């Protein structure tokens with residue numbers, strides 16, 4: 001009564017080799033699940049993190065390489081343009097030839113980089129103003145500095161676009177880094193040395209005089225500027241309530257309530273806004289509605305910005321763009337980035353060029369590349385099996401509402417309404433295969449030169465930004481998928497109320513039509529519940545069946561939700577992570593993803609139970625003295641085998657909304673009565689605490 005199928009001994013092989021039986025699963029189910037993997041493997045020098053998810057991603061890139069690298073005679077133009085962009089990206093001879101000179105020719109278009117410019121005040125500083133310089137950077141190149149203004153979906157009306165104003169991203173991974181002490185010191189030092197190294201090469205290439213002291217001096221200035229910007233930004237934790245974040249305002253209110261004085265403006269929001277939108281030829285008057293996400297950042301900006309020269313501002317502004325660009329130049333410019341990324345990521349080397357390039361084309365031509373990927377790599381009847389799976393887990397969520405004692409009937413039923421209304425996207429959109437005209441036309445307006453990678457990348461920045469801006473007055477496309485298909489991941493959009501499972505994750509260990517159902521439910525099954533449960537986490541409960549930010553909770557049920565979820569805030573917030581020097585997880589910033597995990601695991605388990613009810617129990621797997629309840633959780637766990645470099649652990653504890661994989665396992669199974677049953681765990685065994693968190 002052992003299954004002896006080749007597909008059976010495949011997954012058994014994988015389960016066996018990853019796990020370590022020497023460990024008591026009730027003591028540390030991560031070590032049990034994954035201890036075999038830990039011992040056998042080492043984080044490559046190019047990886048900040050490694051494990052099964054990351055391995056799937058390296059394997060996906062291999063297919064991408066196979067599909068991109070060989071011209072084919074009946075390649076439609078869409079595929080021809082991706083291949084040419086790939087070839088343009090992997091030709092380092094051509095790139096190295098060009099030195100920095102494609103940067104040098106850019107710089108005049110963004111009002112210069114002062115520290116690397118003679119007589120900048122004369123050249124640029126006379127025409128300069130904040131409104132134009134920020135706007136140029138924003139509209140043409142999609143780099144948002146100082147004040148991030150973008151066109152996105154209106155949270156309170158999901159068919160429309162609105163102008164938003166938000167705080168800008170920083171050059172270091174999180175506001176925390178800018179303390180620049182302790183675990184942060186080297187990142188801070190490498191950052192400014194990076195500035196300095198880049199200003200130096202530019203100066204040398206322009207054959208300008210180099211004074212190390214005035215470089216150190218301007219670039220430290222830029223750091224002090226951004227420190228202030230950083231401290232002015234709002235924490236993630238003050239930003240996690242979308243009803244509070246949503247402040248709709250007329251450009252006219254904005255002008256009255258958020259004055260700025262830059263280089264002695266003073267600052268004019270209408271001009272700023274028009275200097276952006278005039279680029280898709282759109283007209284803004286002071287009656288425009290705007291969603292302001294960081295009112296308090298803007299208020300705080302005021303007395304900071306006043307202190308600094310036009311030269312100072314622009315030295316930061318341009319740096320934040322040049323940052324990104326420098327690894328698309330010659331080796332010496334690539335070199336200049338070494339210590340910085342070592343500090344942030346721990347890696348001693350860059351990823352293979354072909355891999356970077358595959359990934360880049362994927363990210364800029366996701367439909368073109370998803371079509372090639374799925375034709376190479378994805379099965380087709382997979383789509384049908386997952387759909388039915390998704391239908392099952394959706395039902396279980398609905399049916400579960402009835403057992404949840406912390407909601408009221410009105411709220412439950414509105415929650416039902418939302419479930420049923422979730423839109424599922426599976427594998428890929430048929431169109432990218434069956435409609436060449438459509439596929440070609442999405443890239444019509446791009447044309448790549450094979451010896452011109454940098455110009456290609458620039459063209460994509462401008463194209464993408466022009467396209468985004470063009471949306472202001474147009475309706476949101478209800479057909480758009482929120483991920484390419486060539487992605488190892490799944491997704492939920494609140495704005496759209498849509499779950500998506502790209503072909504790339506539809507493979508072992510999450511899914512195969514031929515592997516045991518225990519495994520599929522514990523794999524893609526729990527992924528499905530994760531994504532659906534996002535519709536009802538601390539963010540996505542605030543949006544209704546239609547993707548609109550509107551309150552559909554009673555006060556009591558909402559207050560209960562906070563109460564139930566607070567348990568997970570504390571649980572995870574109480575994990576400390578050796579690889580990040582004992583620092584604790586942020587229990588608030590991971591909350592949503594933690595809720596998704598615990599809700600999703602439970603949902604999937606329930607569906608598997610239902611499956612057994614209906615269908616009977618499964619042939620066992622050879623090599624493994626475990627039943628299928630046990631394998632369900634094993635495979636759940638092994639999804640997350642892996643580990644982190646210290647430097648990157650320090651990064652993601654702050655910047656990742658996910659808990660690290662080991663604690664997604666630990667926290668989730670800790671909360672799972674069904675787990676301690678399967679493995680016969682004594683009370684208050686580490687994996688079986690008396691107190692268990694539950695929301696969904």
Ligand SMILES: C[C@H](NC(=O)[C@H](Cc1ccccc1)NC(=O)[C@H](S)Cc1ccccc1)C(=O)O
Pocket residue numbers: 053489490491492526527530531534593596639657658
């Ligand atoms: C891999 C990891 N993703 C996930 O954990 C799951 C998808 C997933 C759920 C459960 C088990 C495996 C994968 N997806 C997610 O949690 C969210 S809804 C998707 C997301 C994408 C980018 C940033 C943040 C979130 C990651 O993006 O770092």
Ligand SMILES: *[C@@H]1O[C@H](CO)[C@@H](O)[C@H](O)[C@H]1NC(C)=O
Pocket residue numbers: 087091093094450451
């Ligand atoms: C790379 O580009 C250079 C410069 O145009 C060219 O000489 C060479 O043929 C290209 N190599 C490949 C393999 O495309």
Ligand SMILES: *[C@@H]1O[C@H](CO)[C@@H](O)[C@H](O)[C@H]1NC(C)=O
Pocket residue numbers: 129271272274275278
């Ligand atoms: C913005 O104001 C500046 C003032 O220097 C002016 O030169 C420019 O034409 C204005 N732009 C728009 C789009 O109104």
Ligand SMILES: *[C@@H]1O[C@H](CO)[C@@H](O)[C@H](O)[C@H]1NC(C)=O
Pocket residue numbers: 569570571572573574584587
């Ligand atoms: C740990 O949990 C306790 C209560 O269970 C809570 O008071 C404390 O704040 C938590 N620690 C952290 C850092 O979250």
Ligand SMILES: [Zn+2]
Pocket residue numbers: 530531534593596
């Ligand atoms: Zn998630």
